[PDB]
Amino acid sequence: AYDRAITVFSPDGRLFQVEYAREAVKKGSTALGMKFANGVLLISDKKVRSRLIEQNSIEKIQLIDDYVAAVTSGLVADARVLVDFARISAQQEKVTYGSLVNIENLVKRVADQMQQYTQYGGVRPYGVSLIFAGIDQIGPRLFDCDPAGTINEYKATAIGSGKDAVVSFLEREYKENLPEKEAVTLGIKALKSSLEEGEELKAPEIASITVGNKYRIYDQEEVKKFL
Amino acid sequence: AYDRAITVFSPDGRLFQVEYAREAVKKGSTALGMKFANGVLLISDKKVRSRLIEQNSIEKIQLIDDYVAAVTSGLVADARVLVDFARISAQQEKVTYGSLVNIENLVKRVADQMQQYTQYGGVRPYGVSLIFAGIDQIGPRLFDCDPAGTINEYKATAIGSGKDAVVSFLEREYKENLPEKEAVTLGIKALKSSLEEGEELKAPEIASITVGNKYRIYDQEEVKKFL
Amino acid sequence: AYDRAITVFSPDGRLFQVEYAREAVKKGSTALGMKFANGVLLISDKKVRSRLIEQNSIEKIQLIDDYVAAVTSGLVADARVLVDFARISAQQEKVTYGSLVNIENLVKRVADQMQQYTQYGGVRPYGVSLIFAGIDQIGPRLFDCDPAGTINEYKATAIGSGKDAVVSFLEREYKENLPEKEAVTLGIKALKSSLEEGEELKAPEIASITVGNKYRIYDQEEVKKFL
Amino acid sequence: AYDRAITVFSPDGRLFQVEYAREAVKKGSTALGMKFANGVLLISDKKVRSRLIEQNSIEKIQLIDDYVAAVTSGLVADARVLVDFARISAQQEKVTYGSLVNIENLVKRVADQMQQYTQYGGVRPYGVSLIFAGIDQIGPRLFDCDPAGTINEYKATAIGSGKDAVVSFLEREYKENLPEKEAVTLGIKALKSSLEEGEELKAPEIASITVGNKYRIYDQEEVKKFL
Amino acid sequence: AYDRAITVFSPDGRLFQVEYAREAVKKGSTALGMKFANGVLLISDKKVRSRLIEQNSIEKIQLIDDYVAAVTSGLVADARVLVDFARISAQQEKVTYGSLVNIENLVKRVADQMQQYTQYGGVRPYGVSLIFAGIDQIGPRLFDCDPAGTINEYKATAIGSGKDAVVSFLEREYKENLPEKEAVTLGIKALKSSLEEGEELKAPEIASITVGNKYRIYDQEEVKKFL
Amino acid sequence: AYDRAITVFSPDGRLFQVEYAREAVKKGSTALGMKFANGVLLISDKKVRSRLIEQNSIEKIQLIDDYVAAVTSGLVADARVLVDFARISAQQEKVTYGSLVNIENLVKRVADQMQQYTQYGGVRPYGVSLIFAGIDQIGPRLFDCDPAGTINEYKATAIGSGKDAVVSFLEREYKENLPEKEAVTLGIKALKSSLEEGEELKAPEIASITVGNKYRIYDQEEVKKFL
Amino acid sequence: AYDRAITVFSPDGRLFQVEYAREAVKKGSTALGMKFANGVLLISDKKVRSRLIEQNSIEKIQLIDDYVAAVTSGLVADARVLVDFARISAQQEKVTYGSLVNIENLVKRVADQMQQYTQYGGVRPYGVSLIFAGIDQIGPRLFDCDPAGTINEYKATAIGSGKDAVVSFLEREYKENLPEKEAVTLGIKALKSSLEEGEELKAPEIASITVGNKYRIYDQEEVKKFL
Amino acid sequence: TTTVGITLKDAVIMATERRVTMENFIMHKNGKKLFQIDTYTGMTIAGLVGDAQVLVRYMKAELELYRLQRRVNMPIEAVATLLSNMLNQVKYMPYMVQLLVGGIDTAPHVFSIDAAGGSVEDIYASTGSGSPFVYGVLESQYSEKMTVDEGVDLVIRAISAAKQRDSASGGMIDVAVITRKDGYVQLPTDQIESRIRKLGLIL
Amino acid sequence: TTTVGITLKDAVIMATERRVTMENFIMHKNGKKLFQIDTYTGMTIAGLVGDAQVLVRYMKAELELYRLQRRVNMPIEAVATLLSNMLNQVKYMPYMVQLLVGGIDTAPHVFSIDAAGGSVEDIYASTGSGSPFVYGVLESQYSEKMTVDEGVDLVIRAISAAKQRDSASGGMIDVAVITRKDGYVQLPTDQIESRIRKLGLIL
C-alpha cells in the first residue's frame, strides 16, 4: 500500500520508492575506489554484452574535472544526467571562487539534487550510485552517494552487484597508505573475489591520481599487466 | 501494480513504462548501421504498403546535416519530433562553435531530451529508437539511442522488428574495415536473415559517407544491384 | 487497464487512447483525394440530412490558402480548430519567407500539434483525420494526417466510413495522369462503391487545382453532370 | 469506465462527458428560431414558476448587439457566462474592423471557447446550447451551437425540452420567405405543439429583425395578439 | 460514481457537487426580502443561542453600500468572503463609472464568481445563497443568487431552512405596493409561519430602503413593536 | 467516500475534512477569555511534561500587539504560523492607516486565510482554534475563530479539551462588569471545574488589559495568589 | 484509509503521515544536549560501520554559526538540507540586523519550513528531528524541533533511538548548574544507559559553548578521557 | 569596405576586398567578407563586423536546416525576406549591417538588405564605404550582355577603383561566381592576381 | 596596455607587459594579462580589467568542460567563435575588452576579438594603447620564416618599443610559447631578462 508514491512514508517511517531505486543500483557492474599513499584510485568492471560495441566509449569512469572523477552504477541515462550536473556544478564553483577547495561540497550539491527527487510528487528518484574520488586542498578524497542523496567518506568502497563481496574482501585485506601498484593489485584481487564459478575478469577501467598531479586513465596494456 | 506510471519503480528497481515504450520500437521496420573502411553506412527496410502511396516521400533515413544521418524505429510522429529536435540542436552547436566537433554530444542532447520524459509525471516516454551515423573530428561514428535515453557507440548495430536476427548475424559475420561494397553486401545479408518464412526483400534505403565527403543516398537502381 | 490515459503505454507498446481517437475518425463522411495530370482534386460526401438545414455552409472541403485545401473526418469542432490552426500556420510561413515552398512542412506543423496532444497528461488527442491537397514548388501534393500525428503522401487516398471500400476500388482502378474530368469520374465511381447497397449519392463537394492556377470549387450544377 | 473524464475516449471513439453535458441542455425551456422574408426571428417559452417572480427580468432572449441575438438552453449560469463572452467578442471584432461582416465568425469564436472545455483536464464542458440569429453583410443568419462546440446553420431550428416536437412540426409546416406575421404565427403554433395534453402557452418572448433594421423585442400586449 | 467532483456530469446532465452545496444553504437561518411601495426590505431570523455571545455583531444583514444590502444562508465563512467580494466589486464599479446604475450587474459579478467555482477542478463551490436588495436607477430591486451562480429577480423571496414555508405563505398573502409598516408586518407574519409550533420569534434583524434615501437598519427597539 | 478531500461536499452538504480538523483542536490545552469592567482577560492552562522543560519559553498567550493577544488550541506548529500571520497583518493595517480601529477586521483577515484552506485542493485546513482579546475604538473585544474560518464575538468563551466544562460553568457563573480581580477568580474556578478526579491545576498563564492601557502578563508570583 | 496523504485529517483529527515521519527519526542514533553553568553542550552517539569509513567526516554535530550548533536524527539527506537551510537563514538574519539576538527565531524559521511540508499536497514531511544549542543575547539555549515543526525549549533533552532511556535517566540525574566537566560526565553516563546488553560506547562526538566564547568541538582524544 | 554583386544571363558574380579598420587604423588586411550560405547562394557583409558575422552564422545554419526540411534550396527571394523580417524585428536594437544576397534559383538574383530589413532586388548593387566608386564604374561599364569572364573583370575593376579612393577599402579582391552548372565557386587567388596583372591594376 | 600574438610555422608566441593605470596613476606594476585557457590555447586581455577577468574565468571553465565532454580540445577558431557569440549577445551592454586568442590545433592560429564580438584571424595582432607601436616593429621586422627564438626576440623588442612610447604600458614582459610538442609554456622571467640584456634594451 505504501510503496507506490515517493511522497508516502510507510508506518515504520520508510520510503520504499527510494529503496526500490537502490535495487536498480545493485544490478549495475561492480566499481570500487580506494585511497593509497598520497593518492586515490578507481577501478571499474564493465558488463560487456556484444563485441559490436565500441568498448572504449560511454565509459564507466568519468572525469568531472582534471582532479576529480566519478564512477556510477544503476540506470545509465540517469547516471549521465548526474555526471553532466556534477561537471557544470564544478565549473560554476571554479568561476565563482577560482577553484574547488573541498570536493565534499561538489558531492553535496549532487546529493542535494538527488534528495530533491525523493521529496516532491510528480518526480522519480535517480536510480544511481556514484563514487567520487580526487584531490582537493584537504588531500585525496573518496565519497559515495546513493539514490536518497546519502553521502559517506571512505578509505575504500564499492558499488554495483559485487559490492558486498568487494567490501568484505577489502575489509579483511585493506591497508592504508599502500604504494600505487600494490593498491591497484589489491583492487583487482577484490574485484576478482566477486566473480563466481571460474568467471574471468576482462580488462576493467582504472584511473588514478596523486597529490600535485592530474588524473591518469590506465590504457589497455597497463591494466592487462595486472590481469 | 508497478507498470502504470513512469515515475514508479518496481520493487526490483525497474521502470516498466520505459520497458513498454521499447516494445513499440520492436514493431518498426528493421534498420541497421555499420562502420566500414573510413566510412559508415545505414540501411533501412522499406515496408511497402500500396501502389497508391508516394514512395519517394517516405524516408526512414533522415539527414541531420551533411555529415550526420539517422534512421528511426517505433512511433512515427514521435520519431519525426526527435529528428526535428536533433536538426535544430546540430545547427545550435554549429552557430555557437562554428562546427560540430564530436557527434556524441549531439546524440547525448537527443538522449537527454528522451531521458527527461522518463522522470516526470504527466509525460510519456518517446516510443522511439534511433541510429545516428556520421563523420566528425574523431572519425566515423555510429550510435544508437533508446526510449530511456540510453546510448552506446557501435561498430555495427540494428533496430526494429528484426533487431535480434540482424545483431546475431553481425556478431557472427561482421568485421572491421570492409570496403564499402562488402559492408553493403554484408548488411543486405544481415537484413535478409531477419525476413524469415521465405519472404522477399524489397528495395531498402541505403546511405553512406566516407571521410572527407558528404552523405550520399543510394538511388533505387544502385540498391537493386545488391538485391 | 492500459487504455484510460494517453500517457500510459500498454505492455505491447500501444497507446490505446490514440487508437480510440481513430475510432472517432471512422464515423465521419467519406472523402477522398487524387492526383491527376498536373493537378489534384478532393471530393467529399455530404451527409446533408434535413430540409431545415442551410445546404451552403460548414462545408467539408476547406481552403487553407488559394493553393491548398483540406477535408476532415471525425470530431467536427476539433476539425474546425485544426483547420484554423493550418490556415494561420500557412500565413506565418508566407510572411516569414514570402511563399510556401513545400506543403509537406505545413502538414508536419499541423501533425506536430496533434502529436503533442498524445504525449502530455491533461489533454486528449484530436479525434480528426485530414487530407491535404495542393500545389507547391514540387508540384501537386496529397497528404493525410491522423490523430497520432502520422502523415503519408499519396497518389490517391480516402478518410471517413467508406475509406476501406474507396481505397480497394482505387487500388484496382486508379491510374496516374488522368485528365481532370476522368479523375473526377473515377472518384465519383470510387465513392459510389462505398455506399450501403441501394443508397443514392447526393451531390458531393468537389474541388480541384492545376499547376499555375488557384483552387476552384465546383458549383452545385457542375457536380450534377457527374452524378 | 470511459465516462468520468472529459479527456478520455471510449473504445468506440466517444466523449461521454460531452454527451452528458448535452443532457443538461435537454432540460431547458423551449426556444426556436426561423428565417422569414428578409429577416429572422426568435421565440422562447419561459418556465414561469410563481407570481412572486419579477418577469420582465433574466430574459431567455439576449441581444449580443443591435443586429444579433441569442437564446440559450441548459445550465443558466453557464449560459450567462457564454452570452457575456459573445457580447465582448462581438465588440472586439467591431473595434478591430469597424463592423461584424459575418455572424458565423462570432459563433465560431463562441463555439471554439466551448470546444476548449472538452479537450483539457480540470474543466468541465458548458452545459449549454445557443441559437444565434441576426443580420450581417451576407443576409439573415440562424445558427446553433452545442456543448461540444458543434455548429450548424439553419432555416428553422429549436433547442430545449420541446426541441423534438418543435422540429418535427417545422419539418412539415415550415416554408421559406413567410411575411413576418405569418412566421411568428407558425412559430407560436410550433411551440404550442410541444406542450403536454391540455397545457397552455403563457405568452412567450418574441424578437425579430429585418434587413436594414435593428432588432425589435415584442412587448407583452404585442405577443398577446398571437396567443 | 458521478457525485465526487464538480467537473463531472452525471449521465442525466447533473452536477451533483453543486446540488450538495445547495444542501448547506438549507441549514441556514431563514431570511426574506420584499418590495413595498417605493422600497424594499430584508428580514433575518437568527437562532442566537448562548447568553455568552455578543448579539450585536456578526449580523445576517450586511450593507454592500448605502443603497444595497445582502443577507446570506449556508457556510458562514464562505458567505463572509462573498460579501467582501460584493463590497469591493460595488466600489470598483462606482470608481469606474461614478455610480452603480443597475444592481443587477453587481449581482451577476457575484454570481459569475460562484459559477466559476462549479467549472474548474481543484476547487469547491461556495455553500451559500444570498438575497440582494436595494435601489438603483431602475427602482427598488430584489434578487437571489445560489451556489451555482443562478440568479432571479423577485417581488418577494426567502432563503434558509424555512424558505418553503415563508414562500408558500407569501404566495397567498403577499401584495404589491404595501406601505412600509404593512410590508414588515406581513414579513414578520411570514417568518412566524415557518416556525416549529410552540416555538417563538426572538427579535429578527430588519432593514429597509425607500427611493431617495439610504438604508436604515431597524434598532432593537423598533423591531419589538412588530412582535 | 465523502470525507477524504477538502473540496468534496457530502450529500447532506457537509465538509468532513473541516470537521475532522476541528477534532485536532479538541485535543489541545484549555484556555478561556472573558470581558470584565473596562477590560478583557485570557487564561491558559497547559500540561508541562518533564522538569527538564524550560518554562517562560512556554508559549500559550501570544501578544499580537500591545493591545491585542491570542491563545490557540490544536496543532501547535499550524498555530504558530497563524499567530505570525496575525502579527504581520496587524502591522500592515497600522502602517496603512496609522492604527487598528476595529480588532474585528484583524480577526477576519486571519479567518479568511483559514477559510481559503477549506476551499482549494492541494492543501489541508489549519487544525487550530484561536481566541483574540484586546481593546480598539469600540472597547474591549473578544473573538474566537475555528478551522473553517468561522468567527464569533463573545462576553466569555473557551477552547481546547475542557471547553465544554468551562463554557457550562461560565454559562451558570459569568456576570458582566466584574472588577478584574473577580474576573480572574471566576476564570480560575471555571478552569478548575474542567479538571478530573484530583488535579488541582499548576500555575496557568494569565493576561489582561483595560481601557487606556496596554497588555499585562501576570507573572508566576501574581498568578499564585489566585491558586 | 486516512494515512496516505499529508493533506488528509483522520476522523480523530490526526495527520498520520506526520506521525510516520517521526518513526524515521526514532531509528536514528541517540543525541542529547544539556545546559550547564553559563553553557550548553551536545553529545552524539556516532554508530560505527566498517574501518573503511573515513572517521570524522560526516559529523552528526553541525555548526550553524560560531555560536549555534545542531544535531539531527532521522533521514540523513533530509537532515543535511535542513542544516544548509539553518546556516543560510542565520546569515540572512545577521546581514539584516548585524547579529542574531534570539536563537528561538532561527529555530522557528527552520520549524516553519518543516511545517509547510505537512500542509501542501505533492510534498512529503522532513523525516528529521533536530536539537539546536547555542548562546544568544538571552543566554545559553536549547531547543528541539520535530517533523511537524513543533518546538520546545529545554534544560536537557535527546532524540534518536535511545531517547526515552536518555530522558528517563536525565529526569532523575540532571542537575541545574553543573560545571562543564561534570555536565559532560553526566551526559556520557546518560548516553551509556541507553545501550542494551552490555554494549560498548565507542567515541561519541562532543561540543560545548560557554558565555563569551565560541563553540569547541572536542578532539577524539579529549572524548576518550570520559570513556 | 567594398562589396559588389552583379547578375548576368545565367550567372551571379560577387566580390569584396578584405580591409578591416578601426577608424584610420588598419587592424586586419585579410578579413573575410564574402561567404557561401547555401548551394547556389552567397552573401557579402559590410558594417559592424560582429553583427555581420553572427548574421553569417545564422544564415548558414538556417539555410541548411530549411533545405533539409524542404528537400529544396530556399529561393533567393525567400532568403532576402527571411533576413528582412529578422532585421526589421530588431530595428530599434539593430544589426548595424548592409548585406548583399545573391544566387540562382530559376533565375539569377541580387538583393540588397539594409539595417532596418528593407530589401530590394536589383541587376547589380554595391555596399560599404567604397560603393559609390563601384557604382561609378558599373554605371559606365556594365552590360547585361557580358560574359562571366567580362563580369569578373568588371568587378575586379570596380573594386580596384574603390580601393584607390576609399582608405577603408584594401587588400586582396575575393570573387565568387554562381551558376546552376557549377554552383557557388570561389575563384583562386592566383586567377584574380593574373587578371589584375592583365588588366593593368595595383594594391 | 600592450599585448601581441604572432604565428610561426609550428608555433604561437604571445606576450604582454603588466602595467595597470587609472588615468596617469600607476596603481599596479605587475598585473597579469596573458593566460593559459586550454592545453594549447592562450588569451591576452586589454580594456576594462573587471570585464576581461570575468571572461578569462569563463573561458578557462568552458574550455575545460568542452574538453571533458568532447574528448578533444576546442579548435582555436571555435574559441574565437564562442567569444564572438558571447560578446555580440551583450553588444548594447558590452564587455569593454579587446582579446587575442592564440593556439595550436592542426595549425597555429591568432584571432583578434573586439567588444562587439567581431573576430578576425591574422598572421599577427596587437592590442591595447601600445599596439600601434608594436605594429610598427612587426611591420618592419616580422618574417614567417622566423624561428621560435627569433620570434621571442621580436615580441620583446616590439613590447619594449611600446613601453618607451606608451605611458599606459610598462613593467616586466611575460611571454608564452605554444607548440604541439611542449604545449603552452610560459617562459621563465630570468630567460626574458637575459634576452632583454642581450638585445640591448632597458626600463
Question: In whole angstroms, what separates CA C2 from the centre of its chain?
Answer: 30
H64/B63 touch (CB, cutoff 8 Å), yes or no: no
Where are the extended beta strands (E) located within I3-134?
A: 3-8, 11-16, 20-22, 25-28, 34-38, 41-47, 97-104, 108-113, 119-122, 124-127
Query: Is residue D147 helix, strand or coil?
Result: coil
Can you give the residue ranges of every domain in chain I?
1-203
B96/I82 touch (CB, cutoff 8 Å), yes or no: yes
d(CA D103, CA D134): 8
Helix E180-192 to helix E163-173 angle, to the nearest 10 degrees?
A: 130
Question: In whole angstroms, what separates CA G47 from the centre of its chain?
Answer: 16
Phi-psi category of residue F139: left, alpha or beta, with phi > 0 → left and psi -120 to 50 → alpha: left
Q: Which three cell numbers stand for residue C17?
A: 487512447
I58/A65 touch (CB, cutoff 8 Å), yes or no: no
Residue for cell digits 604541439?
I180
Task: Flag whether H touches G (3+ CB pairs, 8 A cutoff).
Answer: no
What's at C193, amino acid-wise? S
Q: Which helix (H) or strand (E) holds F40?
A: strand F39-44
Taking CA atoms, D58 is separated from A81, A114, D28, D47, D54, in Å, by 61, 59, 14, 12, 9
Residues of I with CB under 8 A from a CB of H: 81, 84-85, 87-88, 91-92, 112, 114, 116-120, 122, 125, 132
I75/B138 touch (CB, cutoff 8 Å), yes or no: no
Residue for cell digits 583562386?
H188
3-state DSSP helix/strand/coil % of chain E, to nearest 5 = 35, 25, 40
Cross-chain CB nearest to D58 (options E1, E151, E155)? E151
Q: Which residues contact I13 (CB under 8 A, 6 or more apart)?
A: I5, I6, I148, I151, I152, I155, I175, I176, I177, I178
- Residues on chain G touching A14 (C-beta within 8 angstroms): 24
Taking CA atoms, H104 is separated from C105, D83, F204, H130, in Å, by 23, 56, 96, 26
- Residues on chain A touching G75 (C-beta within 8 angstroms): 15, 148
Closest CA to F42 of F215, F211, F214: F215
Q: Taking the CA of residue E13 as centre, how many other CA atoms within 13 Å lie in the half-sphere pointing to its CB?
A: 17
Task: Flag whether G touches A (3+ CB pairs, 8 A cutoff).
Answer: yes
d(CA C9, CA G47): 46
Q: What is the least distance, in Å, from the CA of B98 to any CA of chain I?
A: 6
Taking CA atoms, D203 is separated from D4, D44, D130, D227, G34, in Å, by 40, 9, 21, 7, 88
Q: Which residues contact C88 (CB under 8 A, 6 or more apart)?
A: none
- Give one DSSP letter per residue of E101-156, joined into a string: --HHHHHHHHHHHHHHTTTBSSB----EEEEEEEEETTEEEEEEE-TT--EEEBSE
Locate breaks in chain C with C to N over 2.5 A; list the residue preceding each.
none
Locate breaks in chain G with C to N over 2.5 A; list the residue preceding each.
none
CB I120 within 8 A of CB H49: yes
| Tally of CB atoms within 10 A around C57 | 14
CATH code reported for the domain at D1-227: 3.60.20.10
Q: What is the least distance, in Å, from the CA of B27 to any CA of chain C?
A: 9
Q: Which three cell numbers stand for residue I57?
A: 574565468
Sign of the C-alpha dihedral, residues D96, D102, D108, D113?
A: positive
Q: Are strands F140-145 and F128-135 parallel, antiparallel or unpaired?
A: antiparallel
d(CA I123, CA I8): 8
Cross-chain CB nearest to D123 (options E12, E119, E155)? E119
- Residues on chain A touching I65 (C-beta within 8 angstroms): 87-88, 91
d(CA I191, CA I199): 12
Closest CA to D65 of D170, D135, D157: D135
Q: What is the least distance, in Å, from the CA of D224 to any CA of chain E?
A: 23
C80/D115 touch (CB, cutoff 8 Å), yes or no: yes
- Residues on chain H touching I88 (C-beta within 8 angstroms): 50-51, 53-54
Q: Which three cell numbers stand for residue C49?
A: 440530412
Active site positions of I, annotated: 1
Q: Which helix (H) or strand (E) holds H110?
A: strand H108-113
Closest CA to B203 of B16, B21, B48, B25: B48
The correct answer on CATH 3.60.20.10 for the domain covering H1-203 is yes
Q: What is the least distance, in Å, from the CA of H50 to any CA of chain I?
A: 4
Nearest-CA residue of chain B relative to A128? B13
> Given CB atoms, is E155 within the 8 Å cutoff of chain F?
no
Q: Tell me, what DSSP letter sits at residue D79?
A: H
> Given CB atoms, is I106 within the 8 Å cutoff of chain B?
no
> Given CB atoms, is C109 within the 8 Å cutoff of chain B?
no
Sign of the C-alpha dihedral, residues B93, B99, B104, B105?
A: negative
CB D163 within 8 A of CB D22: no
Q: Tell me, what DSSP letter sits at residue F189?
A: H
G12/F3 touch (CB, cutoff 8 Å), yes or no: no
| Tally of CB atoms within 10 A around A189 | 14
G26/A11 touch (CB, cutoff 8 Å), yes or no: no
Interface test with E, best of D6, D18, D54 (most E CBs within 10 A): D54
Cross-chain CB nearest to I81 (options B97, B102, B104)? B97
Sign of the C-alpha dihedral, residues B173, B174, B176, B181?
A: positive
Q: Taking the CA of residue A32 as centre, how many other CA atoms within 13 Å lie in the half-sphere pointing to its CB?
A: 33
- Residues on chain A touching B154 (C-beta within 8 angstroms): 52-54
Helix H148-165 to helix H131-141 angle, to the nearest 10 degrees?
A: 140
> Given CB atoms, is D209 within the 8 Å cutoff of chain E?
no
Beta bridge partners of H43: H35, H101
| Tally of CB atoms within 10 A around F211 | 11
> Given CB atoms, is G54 within the 8 Å cutoff of chain A?
yes
B94/H57 touch (CB, cutoff 8 Å), yes or no: yes
d(CA C202, CA C181): 19
B78/C115 touch (CB, cutoff 8 Å), yes or no: yes
Approach to solving: X-ray
Closest CA to F16 of B50, I34, G8, C219: G8
Closest CA to I7 of I128, I100, I114: I100
